Design a protein around this motif. Sequence first.
Motif, short mmCIF file in Angstrom:
data_model
loop_
_atom_site.label_atom_id
_atom_site.label_comp_id
_atom_site.label_asym_id
_atom_site.label_seq_id
_atom_site.Cartn_x
_atom_site.Cartn_y
_atom_site.Cartn_z
N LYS A 25 9.24 6.23 -6.61
CA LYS A 25 10.00 5.26 -7.39
C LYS A 25 9.74 3.83 -6.90
N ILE A 26 9.35 2.96 -7.81
CA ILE A 26 9.26 1.54 -7.56
C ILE A 26 10.38 0.82 -8.26
N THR A 27 11.03 -0.08 -7.54
CA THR A 27 12.10 -0.91 -8.10
C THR A 27 11.60 -2.34 -8.16
N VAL A 28 11.64 -2.93 -9.36
CA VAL A 28 11.29 -4.33 -9.55
C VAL A 28 12.59 -5.12 -9.48
N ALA A 29 12.60 -6.10 -8.58
CA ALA A 29 13.74 -6.99 -8.45
C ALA A 29 13.23 -8.40 -8.23
N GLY A 30 14.13 -9.36 -8.28
CA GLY A 30 13.75 -10.77 -8.20
C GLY A 30 13.58 -11.22 -6.76
N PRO A 79 4.92 5.06 1.42
CA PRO A 79 6.31 5.47 1.22
C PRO A 79 6.52 5.92 -0.19
N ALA A 80 7.63 6.61 -0.44
CA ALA A 80 7.88 7.15 -1.78
C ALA A 80 8.75 6.22 -2.60
N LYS A 81 9.36 5.23 -1.95
CA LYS A 81 10.21 4.24 -2.65
C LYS A 81 9.85 2.86 -2.12
N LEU A 82 9.72 1.91 -3.04
CA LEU A 82 9.27 0.57 -2.71
C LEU A 82 9.98 -0.40 -3.64
N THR A 83 10.44 -1.53 -3.08
CA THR A 83 10.96 -2.61 -3.89
C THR A 83 9.94 -3.76 -3.94
N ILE A 84 9.66 -4.24 -5.15
CA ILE A 84 8.69 -5.30 -5.33
C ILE A 84 9.24 -6.34 -6.27
N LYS A 85 8.48 -7.42 -6.44
CA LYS A 85 8.78 -8.46 -7.41
C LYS A 85 7.80 -8.31 -8.55
N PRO A 86 8.13 -8.86 -9.74
CA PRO A 86 7.15 -8.95 -10.80
C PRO A 86 5.92 -9.68 -10.28
N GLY A 87 4.73 -9.23 -10.68
CA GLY A 87 3.49 -9.83 -10.25
C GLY A 87 2.89 -9.30 -8.97
N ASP A 88 3.63 -8.45 -8.25
CA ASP A 88 3.14 -7.88 -7.01
C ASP A 88 2.18 -6.76 -7.37
N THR A 95 0.82 -1.19 0.00
CA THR A 95 0.00 0.00 0.00
C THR A 95 0.87 1.25 0.00
N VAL A 96 0.56 2.17 -0.91
CA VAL A 96 1.22 3.48 -0.93
C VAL A 96 0.12 4.49 -0.70
N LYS A 97 0.25 5.30 0.35
CA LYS A 97 -0.71 6.35 0.61
C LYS A 97 -0.40 7.57 -0.22
N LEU A 98 -1.46 8.15 -0.77
CA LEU A 98 -1.38 9.43 -1.49
C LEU A 98 -1.65 10.57 -0.51
N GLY A 129 14.30 -3.25 -12.57
CA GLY A 129 14.85 -1.91 -12.59
C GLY A 129 13.86 -0.91 -12.06
N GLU A 130 14.08 0.36 -12.36
CA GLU A 130 13.40 1.44 -11.65
C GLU A 130 12.27 2.02 -12.46
N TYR A 131 11.17 2.30 -11.78
CA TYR A 131 9.96 2.89 -12.39
C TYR A 131 9.62 4.16 -11.63
#
Length: 105
Positions: free
Chosen positions: A100-105, A18-27, A4-7, A83-85
Amino acid sequence: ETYTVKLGSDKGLLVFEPAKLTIKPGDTVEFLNNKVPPHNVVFDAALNPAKSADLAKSLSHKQLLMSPGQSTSTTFPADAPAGEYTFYCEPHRGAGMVGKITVAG
Ligand SMILES: [Cu+2]
């Protein structure tokens, strides 16, 4: 996993929390309208790993969320590139509402 990211922060700042989050593909990222609306969520067409405008459009929610409690969500593709979105709220971009969202494995 669903995150969850609050606006708008609980303190009433024009930020993603938060303004930065690391996730996996499919999240899934849920964007929850919190304070000081309206907000929207636009992914940058150039600042994604594929430099793909189409990818960015698919992840975005251009319509403004007007009321606290409204939400939208982005479920990232199962093969989203690593990478970074960079994303932002259009009305508040200039005030610093950028994330910024970062997709990692
Ligand atoms: Cu905003």
